[PDB]
Amino acid sequence: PLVEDMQRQWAGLVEKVQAAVGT
Numbered sequence: 001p002l003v004e005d006m007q008r009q010w011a012g013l014v015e016k017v018q019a020a021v022g023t
């Protein structure tokens with residue numbers, strides 16, 4: 001589960017950081 005782990009919890013973190021596109 002290298003792909004499955006980084007395709008759910010990791011997608012949360014990145015989605016948020018773009019929304020702000022700042023901090």
